[PDB]
Design a protein around this nucleic acid. Sequence first.
RNA 1: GAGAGGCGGCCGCCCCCUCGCCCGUCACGCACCGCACGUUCGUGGGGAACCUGGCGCUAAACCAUUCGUAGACGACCUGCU
RNA 2: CACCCACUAAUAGGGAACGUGAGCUGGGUUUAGACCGUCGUGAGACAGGUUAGUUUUACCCUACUGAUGAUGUGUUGUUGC
RNA 3: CCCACUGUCCCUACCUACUAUCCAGCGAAACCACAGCCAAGGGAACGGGCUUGGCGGAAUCAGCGGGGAAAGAAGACCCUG
RNA 4: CUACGCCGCGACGAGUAGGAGGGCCGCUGCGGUGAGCCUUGAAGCCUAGGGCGCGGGCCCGGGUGGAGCCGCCGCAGGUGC
RNA 5: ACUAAUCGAACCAUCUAGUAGCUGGUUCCCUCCGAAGUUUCCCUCAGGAUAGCUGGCGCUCUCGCAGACCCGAGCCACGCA
Lengths: 402, 153, 201
Amino acid sequence: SHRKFSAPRHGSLGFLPRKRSSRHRGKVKSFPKDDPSKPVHLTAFLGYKAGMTHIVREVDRPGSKVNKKEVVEAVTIVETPPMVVVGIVGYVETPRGLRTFKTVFAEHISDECKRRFYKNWHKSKKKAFTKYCKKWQDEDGKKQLEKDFSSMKKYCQVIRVIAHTQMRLLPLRQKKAHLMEIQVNGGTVAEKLDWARERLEQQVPVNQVFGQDEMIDVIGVTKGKGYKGVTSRWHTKKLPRKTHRGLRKVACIGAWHPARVAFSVARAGQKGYHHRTEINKKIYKIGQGYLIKDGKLIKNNASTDYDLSDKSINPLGGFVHYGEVTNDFVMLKGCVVGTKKRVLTLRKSLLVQTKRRALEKIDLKFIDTTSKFGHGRFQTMEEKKAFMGPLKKDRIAKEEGA
Amino acid sequence: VRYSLDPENPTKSCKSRGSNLRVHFKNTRETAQAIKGMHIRKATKYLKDVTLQKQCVPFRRYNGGVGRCAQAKQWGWTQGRWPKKSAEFLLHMLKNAESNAELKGLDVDSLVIEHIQVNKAPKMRRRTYRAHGRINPYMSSPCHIEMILTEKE
Amino acid sequence: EVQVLVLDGRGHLLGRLAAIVAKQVLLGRKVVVVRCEGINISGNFYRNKLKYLAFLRKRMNTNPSRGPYHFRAPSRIFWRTVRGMLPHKTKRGQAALDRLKVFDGIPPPYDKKKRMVVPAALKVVRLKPTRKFAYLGRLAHEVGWKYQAVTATLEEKRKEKAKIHYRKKKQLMRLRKQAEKNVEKKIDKYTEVLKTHGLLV
RNA sequence: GAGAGGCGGCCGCCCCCUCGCCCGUCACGCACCGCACGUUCGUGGGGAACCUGGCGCUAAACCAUUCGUAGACGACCUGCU
RNA sequence: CACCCACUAAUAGGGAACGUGAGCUGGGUUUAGACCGUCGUGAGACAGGUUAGUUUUACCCUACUGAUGAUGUGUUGUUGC
RNA sequence: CCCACUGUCCCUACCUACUAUCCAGCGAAACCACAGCCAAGGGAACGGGCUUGGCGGAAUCAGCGGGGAAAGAAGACCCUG
RNA sequence: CUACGCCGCGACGAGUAGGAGGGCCGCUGCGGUGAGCCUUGAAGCCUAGGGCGCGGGCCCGGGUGGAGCCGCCGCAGGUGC
RNA sequence: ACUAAUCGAACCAUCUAGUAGCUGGUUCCCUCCGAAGUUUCCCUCAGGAUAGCUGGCGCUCUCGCAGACCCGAGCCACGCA
Ligand SMILES: [Mg+2]
Ligand SMILES: [Mg+2]
Ligand SMILES: [Mg+2]
Ligand SMILES: [Mg+2]
Ligand SMILES: [Mg+2]
Ligand SMILES: [Mg+2]
Ligand SMILES: [Mg+2]
Ligand SMILES: [Mg+2]
Ligand SMILES: [Mg+2]
Ligand SMILES: [Mg+2]
Ligand SMILES: [Mg+2]
Ligand SMILES: [Mg+2]
Ligand SMILES: [Mg+2]
Ligand SMILES: [Mg+2]
Ligand SMILES: [Mg+2]
Ligand SMILES: [Mg+2]
Ligand SMILES: [Mg+2]
Ligand SMILES: [Mg+2]
Ligand SMILES: [Mg+2]
Ligand SMILES: [Mg+2]
Ligand SMILES: [Mg+2]
Ligand SMILES: [Mg+2]
């Protein structure tokens, strides 16, 4: 007999292998479709979720209630130190799919990049790519490399560059860099191969890959929640209090026939740490990072055209559970999958942005830098000192300072 | 006394035996299979590590409900445990066999456990009390153990 | 036979060719079918597409990952047809199935080899010219096969190379005929023997 | 030659025999006394080990420890002159 | 089942052992107590009404959910399709 | 039925104790033709086995309640003697 | 040519419930008989040992064991799972 | 309701191996033959008697038993379907 009232299904069947992700980085799985007309460019980047904050901006949406009105919008800060290119892969299109044709690695692979190849770097002899890097010097290896480049030029359809992050510039414990193949788009195979070969051993900042106020896709692994029941995993209805053997369950897991439990029935297991792709994440700001010309510069991080406050994107007391952000950062809009200091993949959008939500100019008026380690109420150190004046510890330091 | 698998040369070999030993038969069988074929020094330090929970014995046949451990990857297995009582009993038997080897006058730095066997001993009856006036058995599962050590290097 | 039998799949009807191939592999013979995207199926295209969509609907309701595995490549479709004509649940049937190789297009092992044809399975003789038929490549593409375009491009490259090789062979044959016309005083002695015994009209 | 190239073709040098393909002359070979598994691929595939010369290499993985972006336990992310 | 109130794009009909009790609940029916009406001389009866009335076991195999792993590529790792 | 009150609910969340979980020691019972992946067919008219197809990959861990027309009792309802 | 023996020819052979015949099939004990077997190894048990019979079953080899056992003609059953 | 975990008649022993038209089981081999679920009567309808179908034991006769190798020298058995 049918169910007495209709009700939509709990959860999606499009994410059914609700299992721990087989990877921690988060792979792209679909690069933007390549057209030779465009200039040569990269399509992806690797960043680290520093934390969240909120901004104030004036909206330029005609016909809306917030037209020329201020809004407060939550933003996510993703630290993006420049990627370092260390290799080139060529792919050839086969009737069985794409297959890797030839991989050429640069000389002088960075020390942190070599850590990726070793499970136990402490006991390792650090021997990786030592014999390979000697073929960039002798004539025989150089001729073989030229032949490999010619083979890539004449046989490959799409090429990708192996780029790695710079661990030494991040406040995290991990010194093992994250490797990634980033597809090169926009030209003939020869042109993109020349471009990539020039970019070997070089650093690619995030402002070269992405631009202001463009909407990109964020790929990563969500926060792990462990082993969870159906009420927390599939958000099913809680059974009444009078239930005998438990109320945080699913009452009926199937009819008598088909005499089995279907794959579409909500059942307890792993929740979280799933690989997810979210599209249409607008870039509100691309931070410039810290510089030393005459003194340390932090103002280019959170000072706007209306603030003019010599403050950085780092909140008072630092980003909670992350550290201090000193490199380039990308200010996305809204929330992003993953914990703090979780590696994220930023990908160019596969679609064509023509809606008025997209292609809308973003002009920040204020960036909140109050302490997130509590109910912070002062934007900067100097403002807090000017408000609260001298304290007892200031007095006891000043007596010693004479 | 009669052993199974008498040594091919009972002058390079020493024997040990125990009967009705108060250890569980399944854990002892798994531990004995773990130490079978080992050199006597390797077996002794491995049993000490098993007691110290630094190395495990893989539970291969009697593995129903046995949990998984990281030290089972040393073997080709996923499940493993650290039976302290079986390790102590086999350590005592190893010391007895080494003393026998000393008595036979063959050096104990080349001994290898070529044969080790765990046999079920007669069960011993105890009593447990159940819900509705019912009595159920509470048997123990002791074991007979024998081992043969042999000189080779 | 002891050598590998290479069959061109173009212009062949699906079931006829599959039955021939099944009986061949059951006789301890190696069979390789290339260009499985050229296989024809009798009946108009919409009917055969409906047949394969109905096949797509057959899945295990409890756990579709266990159910029938609907293969979308033309080679795998032909392989499944041949398996349907084989006792694939016995050791003999599985051994016979392992002697069959199927490909879309013609791979480098077989693009330099002569390809056989089964007249009993050809569309031109087994089908009336007024009847309609479907291409396995188009049906596979419109049911989920992804590599129709790359297979077409590689087939075009292979056809260009084959055209060059054929022009070389024609030049060689012309030169051979010229050579035969050059040596006839020293060749007529054996030429008349061959003519006497039925060879060499 | 890249679709699975696992292959194919062409040059320069050196060293052989003028033999090898056809029709003929000339005699011989164990001719094993009627008999089967003969005849090839083939120097076949796979595995241990001995000798023989040359040209070359000197590493990782796991456990233990650590982390906590993870976690029932395994597993996972990490760190260690 | 029914009927009514209100919202709604619509408030369509059904199946799966009249889906679903080692999932629940126990209001109903359908034990033992009891009251009423009718019937019976009576014990007692009543698809008539009413009130109170123990809802047991999974640790097995499979299914499903998640978690280790396993086959092959010499070992092992990274990046991938 | 009303006032008050509230997580009964909308609509669930978090925290604590004891477990469950892993380990050292100790260590049962129920149940058991053989066993255990499905669709359809026919069949004692609802198959785990048979027919036809789908297919099938060691050893396991924590859960789970769809199946085993699961277990518990030679049906207490109905009929016969 | 053990006449309860031997030989020839012709036809035929399903089987539940059930009936009958044969059994040089088998178990235990008694009367006879084997100038039977046996500590130079009985019964019993084990056996990748050799065989016989359609079959019930039986004989022989090897091992273990350590004191009893079997064949034939009749007799009698607490006689075959 | 309670009357020693027993109460719409306690417990113990005996009559007692109570009766059962009802359920369950009923132990070696081969060979030959081989069914009925129908008639009549029965407080009979899950059972009997009775006739039918079956088996066993026979008995009374019938054709001759042929030429010691061989070779018949109108008429060709009681009776039965
Ligand atoms: Mg409906
Ligand atoms: Mg309750
Ligand atoms: Mg905070
Ligand atoms: Mg279990
Ligand atoms: Mg108890
Ligand atoms: Mg009690
Ligand atoms: Mg129902
Ligand atoms: Mg149920
Ligand atoms: Mg229930
Ligand atoms: Mg009730
Ligand atoms: Mg009542
Ligand atoms: Mg009255
Ligand atoms: Mg009333
Ligand atoms: Mg009450
Ligand atoms: Mg448990
Ligand atoms: Mg079925
Ligand atoms: Mg009954
Ligand atoms: Mg009863
Ligand atoms: Mg018969
Ligand atoms: Mg008896
Ligand atoms: Mg018996
Ligand atoms: Mg009956």
